[PDB]
Amino acid sequence: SFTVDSARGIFPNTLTADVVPATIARFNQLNAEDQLALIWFAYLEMGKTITVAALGAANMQFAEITMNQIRQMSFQEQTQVMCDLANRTDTPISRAYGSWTANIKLGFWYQLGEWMAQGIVAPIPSGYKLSANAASVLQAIQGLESGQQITVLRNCVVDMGFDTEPVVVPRDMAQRTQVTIEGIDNPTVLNYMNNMNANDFEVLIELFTPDGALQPPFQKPIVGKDAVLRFFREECQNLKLIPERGVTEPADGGYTQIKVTGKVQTPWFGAGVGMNMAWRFLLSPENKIFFVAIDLLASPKELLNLV
Amino acid sequence: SFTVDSARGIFPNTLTADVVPATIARFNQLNAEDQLALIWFAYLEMGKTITVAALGAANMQFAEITMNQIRQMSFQEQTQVMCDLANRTDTPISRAYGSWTANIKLGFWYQLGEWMAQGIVAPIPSGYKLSANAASVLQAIQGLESGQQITVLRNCVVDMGFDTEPVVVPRDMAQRTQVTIEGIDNPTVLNYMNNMNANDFEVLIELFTPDGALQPPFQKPIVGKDAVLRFFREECQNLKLIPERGVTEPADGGYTQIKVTGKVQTPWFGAGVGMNMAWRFLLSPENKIFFVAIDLLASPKELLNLV
Numbered sequence A, B: 001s002f003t004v005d006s007a008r009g010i011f012p013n014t015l016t017a018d019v020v021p022a023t024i025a026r027f028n029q030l031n032a033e034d035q036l037a038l039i040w041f042a043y044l045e046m047g048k049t050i051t052v053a054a055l056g057a058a059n060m061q062f063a064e065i066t067m068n069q070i071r072q073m074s075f076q077e078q079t080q081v082m083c084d085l086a087n088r089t090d091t092p093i094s095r096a097y098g099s100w101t102a103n104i105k106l107g108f109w110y111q112l113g114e115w116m117a118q119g120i121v122a123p124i125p126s127g128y129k130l131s132a133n134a135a136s137v138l139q140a141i142q143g144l145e146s147g148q149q150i151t152v153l154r155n156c157v158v159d160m161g162f163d164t165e166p167v168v169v170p171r172d173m174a175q176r177t178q179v180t181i182e183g184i185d186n187p188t189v190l191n192y193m194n195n196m197n198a199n200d201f202e203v204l205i206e207l208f209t210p211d212g213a214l215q216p217p218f219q220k221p222i223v224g225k226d227a228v229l230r231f232f233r234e235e236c237q238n239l240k241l242i243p244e245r246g247v248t249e250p251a252d253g254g255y256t257q258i259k260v261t262g263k264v265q266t267p268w269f270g271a272g273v274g275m276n277m278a279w280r281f282l283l284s285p286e287n288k289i290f291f292v293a294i295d296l297l298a299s300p301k302e303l304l305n306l307v
């Protein structure tokens, strides 16, 4: 008698990094000039660690034209467009940005940021002073573990713009890895991990029930194979899933609940940031994925919390 | 009675970094596996310093599809394509690469390199041993000043492939800088520098005589406004020219010869690499550029060599 909403609560003693959504909500109270300056300052203290590995799959060409338009504007116009994005204003550029996939939005700011650092576009005021609320939000971010810091920054950037085609390459079979998970050998869980690591989403989606759902960290469940597969193709390429250990528990009505913990790397940072993750699966009696939740964990001890 | 070939020899006591072409020629003797491994090792010791600032103007989309094709190949095929490029073999991919602008060729390898570092494509053997000739070439490169090192690497990469559309954005007028040059106020030289720094090549080209020529470092003169302007648009965007000082000397027949020294930054590295440069101008009696040579200098003392 499970529903997606009932499945959401499996393994309730998993401690997620709710400071991430808390800090994002605080950032969302700031004025646009404070938001831009805060991220610029965080960027100046970790921007060298962002890699180009996600750009190649994103298909940036149309967004890069808009990027180049900003390179042609005056100082006043460049500042206006950047505030329009942060304010989520209804402008043509803000609508275009709001329509892009997360990786395209990130690739846009990544390049604008290097251009600012070089003066190819104008940077942010050299003696700029954050408001009191903004300075406190910056302090909070700087105090977070690396994987929580980059999740704050990512969600702050992806949420900009106005609420209004990737190159997906499955890895050659001979170059694919096989995960090991201490305590877990169920092929549905192992091949969830392996097909994710190989970008083989057409095989991956067949592990799901037709009504199956996937819940990304701090987001609502994505329901149905069509929506889940779209999410895979748009946002989930070139991840490195490094599960470590897991536990299996019977559920009502022949269902099985599985918790796996481990680390995940995003191509935006490669091995420079290891994000502590949990995967919570509810498998049907036919051993298909009815529900999987992916959680960013509050601290590294949560990797060892299988009770 | 000046010709381009006679103009080439002005200011002959300018000491250029001929170790750069010497080292490139040595690299050109190596087998492809040695060439790939040598650059990979140099890359592992300076790849974090390459920035994304040149990608946005390059218009990479077609090349990125070919890049992604390599991401889909097996280990054997990825190694074969990389050797085909280094060997300058006649293959369809090598012909495509050979047709691309320098910045597109560099953006291709830049992304392939990050993908290798992350294992998104297969890297280079972990216990690979350079041949004796290759190990000696690597030592030579590692011993060069930073600006000479990146010129070696650039020309080694750009020369790969088979000898078989950028987004050009002039900077808004209010955001343009004006160079200062100790000892030089001739507007033809100052506005050569300023229009280069503003990517304003349509204004820049009008400073040249119709038969005027530009000689890039270690290359043959590019002759005629059409060819020079094409070179500007394809290869010369987002440079930072920081001239320091110069000297003017009369030439025969009302011509004027001018030597300027200073530093140049490429968007590939921003302020991380300052390249020591000389500009050697031969100006017509009408104060137009008949010939300009751009030289990479052998050492920093050449910045002070105006005799």
Ligand SMILES: CC1=C(/C=C/C(C)=C/C=C/C(C)=C/C=C/C=C(C)/C=C/C=C(C)/C=C/C2=C(C)C(=O)CCC2(C)C)C(C)(C)CCC1
Pocket: A035, A036, A037, A039, A040, A043, A050, A106, A109, A110, A111, A112, A113, A114, A116, A150, A151, A153, A154, A157, A196, A216, A217, A235, A236, A239, A241, A264, A266, A268, A275, A277, A294
């Ligand atoms: C704005 C701005 C600027 C630029 C800021 C820049 C440049 C920010 C760049 C930030 C970036 C690039 C952050 C990247 C973060 C990426 C993360 C945190 C990825 C996390 C993915 C995870 C954890 C995936 C988990 C999953 C698993 C494991 C599954 O099993 C199922 C699917 C999937 C759920 C998705 C400038 C400076 C100019 C100043 C002005 C304002």
Ligand SMILES: CC1=C(/C=C/C(C)=C/C=C/C(C)=C/C=C/C=C(C)/C=C/C=C(C)/C=C/C2=C(C)C(=O)CCC2(C)C)C(C)(C)CCC1
Pocket: B035, B036, B037, B039, B040, B043, B050, B106, B109, B110, B111, B112, B113, B114, B116, B150, B151, B153, B154, B157, B196, B216, B217, B235, B236, B239, B241, B264, B266, B268, B275, B277, B294
């Ligand atoms: C291959 C390869 C790999 C990747 C290697 C990579 C990634 C190399 C990247 C190298 C780069 C990116 C080098 C960039 C160098 C750029 C330079 C040196 C720019 C110099 C420009 C100048 C000096 C301009 C001077 C001019 C002036 C001032 C003028 O007034 C007139 C016009 C202009 C003349 C042009 C992998 C690792 C995967 C391993 C396999 C083999």
Ligand SMILES: NC(=[NH2+])NCCC[C@H](N)C(=O)O
Pocket: A011, A012, A013, A249, A306, A307
């Ligand atoms: N047989 C059972 N129903 N066991 C329940 C396991 C509860 C688990 N230790 C938790 O804290 O969430």
Ligand SMILES: NC(=[NH2+])NCCC[C@H](N)C(=O)O
Pocket: B011, B012, B013, B249, B306, B307
């Ligand atoms: N009046 C002259 N012609 N002077 C020639 C200057 C030569 C210059 N000092 C050089 O070494 O190249």
